[PDB]
Amino acid sequence: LAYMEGGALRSMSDKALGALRLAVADNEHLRDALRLSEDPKRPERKVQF
Amino acid sequence: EMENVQKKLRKLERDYYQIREQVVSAKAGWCAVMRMVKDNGVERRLHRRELAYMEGGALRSMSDKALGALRLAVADNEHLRDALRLSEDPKRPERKVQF
Amino acid sequence: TIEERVKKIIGEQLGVKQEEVTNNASFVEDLGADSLDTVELVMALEEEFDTEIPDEEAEKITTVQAAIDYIN
Amino acid sequence: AIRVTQSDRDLFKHLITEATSYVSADYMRHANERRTHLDEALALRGELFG
């Protein structure tokens, strides 16, 4: 991924997160992790998620 | 001193020419982009002028989230699905209008 | 030629047809070029002939005839 | 009749809102960026002339 600019990475991450929001309606735990991690400045959060 | 300053002037001239060319190409492309939505898409659906006051990043992010949802929404109609999937290419924007 | 390069530039900067753009075709009315459209049109015209126009001299131009006149 | 209308209303609401969001966003970003580039070019032009 070093060979792509930040915009592409951001787009891909958001596009993934969209389907994640659709899917996660099943499980509370993953939903909570998502609802905490989606903010930008908390990468570790996403990692836990 | 003046010659030193004219050096910066010439640098800025080059920069301005570059910006001018870029904006020229942008307007040329946007002409066809508009003439696609010109077919009754512009008014209240595709143009949303309240959004004028935000930047590319937020718009792209929310667009990607919307697509992540819509693709599942358009799971049914194969050709509509194809329009969506192809227009997924950000480099060729007006596809998304056609979709 | 210059008198057709002008029409080419005006058309693809406003989307108007080659036929609509006569020498007297006023941009704001005939070609519907609004403030930013007019500015972009003069910008592209300056690019086409890699020349620059004074601000008041540039804004004075408002018709295909005047545009070609200044250009040529 | 109620069932038919409710189903179709919900489906159209969902699809329209999603598609509009998605497409109007890219359109409006293109528009805003073009405007911003024009503004920057105007600033450069004025400063260069001065």
Ligand SMILES: *P(=O)(O)OCC(C)(C)[C@@H](O)C(=O)NCCC(=O)NCCS
């Ligand atoms: P449109 O109604 O958006 O108007 C655009 C504009 C005519 C105001 C713009 O193109 C413009 O001319 N801005 C700069 C004006 C000027 O001469 N400034 C001095 C140098 S910064």
